[PDB]
Every structure is written in structure tokens, then in C-alpha cells.
């Protein structure tokens, strides 16, 4: 998602808390967007069922 | 605050809490005497119109080569052992050279700084303890031994030294804002209601 | 949302525009996402009704 | 590799401490009183 | 390189290259028989 790593620990174990918020913010946004898409699909499919 | 005779060491930093007064930050901004004037949470042009709870002037003197570490989020010896600023800082840093004020050819060995420390300090923490630090795996007692050192160490402050190595007087303002009945602001007239 | 406050007025009275834009963009992104989620759920409930 | 309509070169001499003042969004009495650059500046600055 | 029988003099200082092995710096740091141990670019704890 444009962050340095997909391993959360490796970002934590290499980049400092003055700057690591920028990468983990990207990770938050990407994973939250995936949850949005998944549950919107589930709602439409459930209405159909 | 500014025109004092002599500032203290960085690990014995002088903290003054100023309250119940009328401040004018414009003339503070409008002097070129301060080599570096940089704020982090407020833009200085707005600083004529903000009302704060009570303000903190933290003052010391350092070597000029360390003024990069005074920013929040920095690391380094000064930044990690004797002086720490928190990353949610709402305030300003101010620095100037005082080569013609407190730099002596005989040597200003009055100004120590902490060179060794067991573990990094809290933000806004002041340490004063001077027990000797053991560097090796060997424990030490008394005052001196192999691989066991005094944590405090002095600057070679003489004006014949190069750039940065002259002393630089540093004052940090750490006002806290918009959570209380504010006290200190404003050369601004209140209109009628 | 990561900005210094959730009010526009104190930000604009505190900061000059070149950093106010940086905070205001994040605030705008968060509020816009909230609107989007709300109207999506309203569409689905309207279909059921 | 780019081509342009109009070029404008502005020249002066300053005190050598004032180089940081030329950047857009910087603040100080030179940038506040006798030469102001807009924030959406495009171009190049040269000093020596 | 430490417990060798003889070294050469300073005008013809011996140069030896060591690589591709395991180096432990604790056992040479704690040995206090050495006159000095002055490391420059790395803190003596950070060698290990």
C-alpha cells in the first residue's frame, strides 16, 4: 500500500516513532478500504439471498 | 529570560514558569539577535493572538553543533540522555551564538553535559545525579577503575575554536493551549459587547 | 484523523495556509469517507423498504 | 527538454545568511518586507 | 593477530585481512590487560 513493508513488526523494528506513523497510516487506510469493499459486497449479496 | 548574565548546563536546565502577564511576541520575532527562531505547532505570525494557560521558558547553553538535535523527533547524545522533547510538542526553539558573551580563551569548563547514561530519559525530565557509569561487564565501586567512567564531561569552550564550537545560548518555549482559562496573551483591545 | 484538532476554526486561527492545507486535506478525506458510507447504507435500506 | 513562453530572471545581492529566506513559504524581514515570492512558484533559484 | 610470537616495527606495520567468520568482541573488550582500547566509529557495546 505504498508503505515500506507489509510486516508490521519490521516497520516497527527498523523505523523510528517520529516517522513510522506515516507508513502505518498507509497500512491502516488500505486495510480499512478492503473491509469496506468486503462488507458492501456481503450486504448486497445478503439482500439478494 | 534573554539578557541574563549566564545560563546553566544542559543537564541542569533552568526552567521558569511565566504566568499572569501581557506578552508581545512581535518584538521577539522582530529582532535578528536570535540566530534561529522556529516553532512547531503555531505559525509565528499568528502568535500575537493566541491565549495560553501558562508558559515555560527552559534555558541553557550548548555547543552550536548540537542545535540540529533540538528539534522534536531527533536522536543523539544530547537528545537521548540529558534533554528530551516530546513529539506532541506545541512550542518554539530559539538559539543564538554567545561567542562574545561567555566564551573564554582560558576555557569555560563550567559547562558540563551528560556523556553516559544507563537508559534514555523521559520527555521533560531533568537528571542531576552524578554516579559513575560502568562501561564494561566488570562492576566497579568507589570513584574510579578500569572501564568505569564518570558520566559528566566538559566542553572545550574557547573563542578560538571553529564554527559551532562556540557556545550557543538556547531557550525553548513550551506553552500549553486551549484547555483551560487562559492567562497570558494579547496587546489587543477588547471591543464592546 | 491525525490532525492537531477536529475544529477548523482553531486550526485556521493557529496556522498559516501552507500547513493548514496539509491538515485540512486529511480532515476532508475522513469526513468524505463518512458521508460515503452513510449514503451507501441508506441506499441498501431504501431498497429493502 | 521543455519549451516555454516567457522567462523572467530576477537578480540582486543579499547578505549571505539570507539564502534560506528565498524559498517560498519562508518568513523573515527580507521575505516580509522587500522581496516576496508566491507559494505556487515554479522556477529555479541560484545563489553564490 | 593478538597472541602472535613477534610483531614487526611501525615503519613496516603488519596488515592482515580477516573476513568470513565469527567475531566476538566481548572476550577482547573485557580483557583488561591491554593498555588502551579506543574505538572510534562504533560504540564498544555496539560491536557485538
Swiss-Prot record, chain D:
Descriptive protein name: Spike protein S1
Description of how the protein assembles with itself and partners: Binds to host ACE2. RBD also interacts with the N-linked glycan on 'Asn-90' of ACE2. Cleavage of S generates a polybasic C-terminal sequence on S1 that binds to host Neuropilin-1 (NRP1) and Neuropilin-2 (NRP2) receptors. Interacts with host integrin alpha-5/beta-1 (ITGA5:ITGB1) and with ACE2 in complex with integrin alpha-5/beta-1 (ITGA5:ITGB1). May interact via cytoplasmic c-terminus with M protein. May interact (via N-terminus) with host bilirubin and biliverdin, thereby preventing antibody binding to the SARS-CoV-2 spike NTD via an allosteric mechanism.
Chain's role: Attaches the virion to the cell membrane by interacting with host receptor, initiating the infection. The major receptor is host ACE2. When S2/S2' has been cleaved, binding to the receptor triggers direct fusion at the cell membrane. When S2/S2' has not been cleaved, binding to the receptor results in internalization of the virus by endocytosis using host TFRC and GRM2 and leading to fusion of the virion membrane with the host endosomal membrane. Alternatively, may use NRP1/NRP2 and integrin as entry receptors.
Annotated region described as Integrin-binding motif, given as residue ranges: 15-17
